[PDB]
Design a protein around this ligand. Structure first.
Ligand code: HEM
Ligand code: HEM
Ligand SMILES: Cc1cc(N)nc(CCCCCc2cc(C)cc(N)n2)c1
Ligand SMILES: Cc1cc(N)nc(CCCCCc2cc(C)cc(N)n2)c1
Ligand SMILES: Cc1cc(N)nc(CCCCCc2cc(C)cc(N)n2)c1
Ligand SMILES: Cc1cc(N)nc(CCCCCc2cc(C)cc(N)n2)c1
Ligand SMILES: C[C@H](O)[C@H](O)[C@H]1CNc2nc(N)[nH]c(=O)c2N1
Ligand SMILES: C[C@H](O)[C@H](O)[C@H]1CNc2nc(N)[nH]c(=O)c2N1
Ligand SMILES: [Cl-]
Ligand SMILES: [Cl-]
Ligand SMILES: [Cl-]
Ligand SMILES: [Cl-]
Ligand SMILES: [Zn+2]
Ligand SMILES: [Zn+2]
Ligand SMILES: [Zn+2]
Lengths: 412, 408
């Protein structure tokens, strides 16, 4: 099977063969496309060895040692380990290759040109929540690099029986608290209200401001999670100002420099890494469009357009669009002036298309989820909008997992 | 089989049961999603398709299983057995046309679906007759700027040798010409079609906004050329409410969007010439027509005139210029009293429509990749709305351009 994608701006046609290695499910059928649905709609030995073998065959192919003595010995070694212990341990080299590939395969990620430059911190020797905290502080400090951001992932011990899971309960390492007020308003980030309530319940003394960095809630080996405050000196933040509008700074906005997803599961060779926080750097629109301008987030559009004195009587003046652009200008300018790494959506999508073409040429394809790849403003003036994409699942992979407060068996 | 969609901005969850009535193919499989791929990657079959449609028709008028329902099914079976096809009643034709729009998963404007004026042109026999039908459609739909939705339906496919086709992709579009320079004058989307028109004898004005002639095929005959009366083509010069220099770009656009190359399938019958029209959403002109690189591509010129810093993408000069172009489009149409809708207002109405459809029909097939506007996506309410895309009949479908099919 050869599948073709077309770019409607350039007429460039690419051929995908890589989808032949695809697995599991998109959620779609011939009757229904689930392409805009956000989420999907204790492993046993017999399913495990095949998954292991397929990963190790990929790994050995990549190092040009396929079918070598080392390859065959490693398959043997893993087979026996699975028979005797019901699981197996990855070599450090396989772990690194796996984590890099999970990012390479991440179909919703526009930043994948960067995939081969990922710093992998092996935290599989970690045993306690205090140990997790120390690993996470080191990750934050290394990745932040005083504003010169470096991609990184920290990998805690894999799942065993599903009763001893390592989990970071935070959805990201750094996020701001949100507090629901008795009057139904929200102080801080509305996205984080439920998690904030949990932290408070667990004993966090909330400052109750608009930009309070949440504590880490960390679970090791299936134990009840424990609270830790990231040292404030490790959390780099950027005050948001605008290059022409001197009132913009008095909106009192700021954001943190380090985007670091901590609630996803990393699958490599059938093993499940339930705590694997990873971080990169922001594309400006994640802050300027989503974080600031979503109605269910900080929701600043009206306030900004008021200060710009836009005609807000009718949507057809495009006041929302005008304010949206100025806010995004402000984020890019603020990060750049403070020398904190950031990429604009024109640059990131241009780089993504170059990456994608390269992957089709060298790898036979690049699974990509258009719904997520196309930026949330100015979509069609970016080169990804007119690019046909094919979405499919390759492993190693990152996956969603249930929020741990829903499934954790409390010890007491 | 029993599906939920969530709106991530409002937490509203809706249940889709309508997808149980879905058909043909999406192009997707369990291994691979083709959501962002633009195109699809006899007597025996006809009666089931007719029955399926007539059952839905009789249900819709609260007469399912009635003698009249059974007699009609009977009548149609007889007709197919004897003539190899059948003819739709006028009521069935109107219902099918309206539902083909209701089912159009890529259309954000479907709140309007029941207010569609259907012009029955099944008695048309010649290209000259087609031309008269289309002028009337144009004049009716335009209505001096107070635009009204309409479709004109020419005779159905028979043996596929006698197709009615409008060769134009829209009833009104601008010519495109490749220049000795190597650049393109006019609309680059229309270069190939313009060439065909020239080959067929059209005397080309060779300007930037030349309204293309119609190329009309009746009864599978060779297509013939007609000029739409200039006075029936309403156009709007584009100016900006604040930038005085904007009008000096010399931009204009036509008021009537009218798709003419699709195929209407109703109860297994295929209407290959079925031009349909509505009114524009502003971004269709301001973002796609003006700002696509392969279209009029004016972003750089507008940015220059605004004196923005064009040295680095991160100044967002492209985004600023995009917004201003789109303000101008809306302002110009509004000032000339030509119906237009902005993307905020259109997407808000679609969400209202979609909730109605879930409530009253059990769903609303929608293609997110097409429904989300091409600028400011996430500040419109459709961005956060999960959608399910599936194919219901009656339907509009792509068909091959006829210059690849037609034997002269
Ligand atoms: C290096 C700079 C990076 C940039 C500019 C970038 C950009 C982005 C953006 C804009 C999104 C969509 C976010 C949203 O829609 O809210 C995303 C998603 C994602 N990225 Fe990246 N990314 C980067 C690095 C990374 C790294 C280091 C990894 C993992 C090792 C990663 C894996 C992912 C995954 C798994 C998703 C999907 C998340 C989900 O489904 O919720 N990215 N990326
Ligand atoms: C009356 C106001 C209407 C509005 C504002 C509107 C809006 C739109 C828009 C914005 C698109 C996508 C255009 C693009 O991406 O270039 C679209 C697609 C479409 N619409 Fe509408 N529409 C309207 C009326 C109609 C009518 C009257 C019909 C048929 C009777 C129709 C059927 C379709 C179909 C079949 C598509 C997809 C065409 C394709 O796949 O190329 N719409 N609509
Ligand atoms: C809180 C949260 C968790 C999660 N799994 N997914 C989301 C939506 C996608 C977030 C991805 C953010 C991101 C992550 C990285 C690594 C870089 C970058 N520029 N941006 C949010
Ligand atoms: C296109 C696509 C890519 C991808 N990485 N993931 C998906 C969703 C697959 C959902 C089921 C797989 C799964 C789910 C969970 C919870 C764990 C695990 N190891 N695997 C789709
Ligand atoms: C030239 C052309 C033909 C075609 N089938 N499809 C396209 C892309 C979609 C065009 C639909 C434009 C439209 C059509 C209608 C009826 C109303 C409205 N506001 N906009 C372009
Ligand atoms: C989701 C979806 C909706 C829709 N209306 N159409 C499709 C494409 C399915 C292929 C349609 C097959 C077909 C093709 C032709 C040429 C005519 C005709 N009556 N039917 C997908
Ligand atoms: C590849 C991509 O699907 C293609 O360019 C689509 C994307 N979304 C679109 N959406 C609309 N409304 N109109 C279009 O023409 C397109 N083009
Ligand atoms: C329903 C819809 O798919 C959902 O809101 C998605 C749409 N596309 C997105 N794209 C990105 N990059 N991030 C998102 O959070 C979303 N949300
Ligand atoms: Cl968003
Ligand atoms: Cl979002
Ligand atoms: Cl476009
Ligand atoms: Cl387009
Ligand atoms: Zn959002
Ligand atoms: Zn799909
Ligand atoms: Zn376009």
């Amino acid at each position: 099977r050869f599948l073709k994608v077309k770019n409607w701006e350039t007429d460039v046609v690419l051929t995908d063969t890589l989808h032949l290695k695809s697995t599991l499910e998109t959620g779609c059928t011939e009757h229904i496309c689930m392409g805009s649905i956000m989420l999907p709609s204790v492993r046993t030995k017999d399913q495990l060895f095949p998954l292991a073998k397929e990963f190790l065959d990929q790994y050995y192919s990549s190092i040009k040692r396929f079918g070598s003595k080392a390859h065959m010995d490693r398959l043997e070694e893993v087979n026996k380990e699975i028979e005797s212990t019901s699981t197996y341990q990855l070599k450090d080299t396989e772990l690194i290759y796996g984590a890099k590939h999970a990012w390479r395969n991440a179909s919703r990620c526009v930043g994948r040109i960067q995939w081969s430059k990922l710093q992998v911190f092996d935290a599989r020797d970690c045993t306690t929540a205090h140990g997790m905290f120390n690993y996470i502080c080191n990750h934050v400090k290394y990745a932040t690099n005083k504003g010169n951001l470096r991609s990184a992932i920290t990998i805690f011990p894999q799942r065993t029986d599903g009763k001893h899971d390592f989990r970071v309960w935070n959805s990201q390492l750094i996020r701001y608290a949100g507090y629901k007020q008795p009057d139904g308003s929200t102080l801080g980030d509305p996205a984080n209200v439920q998690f904030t309530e949990i932290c408070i319940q667990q004993g966090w003394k909330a400052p109750r401001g608009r930009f309070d960095v949440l504590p880490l809630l960390l679970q090791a080996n299936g134990n009840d999670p424990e609270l830790f405050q990231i040292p404030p000196e490790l959390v780099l933040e950027v005050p948001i100002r605008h290059p022409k509008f001197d009132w913009f700074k008095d909106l009192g906005l700021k954001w943190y420099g380090l985007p670091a997803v901590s609630n996803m599961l990393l699958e490599i060779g059938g093993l499940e890494f339930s705590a694997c926080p990873f971080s990169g750097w922001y594309m400006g629109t994640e802050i300027g469009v989503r974080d600031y301008c979503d109605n269910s987030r900080y929701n600043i559009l009206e306030e900004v357009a008021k200060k710009m004195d836009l005609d807000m009587r009718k949507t057809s003046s495009l006041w929302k669009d005008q304010a949206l652009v100025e806010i995004n200008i402000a984020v890019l300018y603020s990060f750049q002036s403070d020398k904190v790494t950031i990429v604009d959506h024109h640059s990131a999508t241009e780089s993504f298309i170059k990456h994608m073409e390269n992957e089709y040429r060298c790898r036979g394809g690049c699974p990509a989820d258009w719904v997520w790849i196309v930026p949330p403003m100015s979509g069609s003036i970016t080169p990804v909008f007119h690019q046909e994409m094919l979405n499919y699942r390759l492993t190693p992979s990152f996956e969603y997992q249930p929020d741990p407060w829903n499934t954790h068996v409390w010890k007491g």
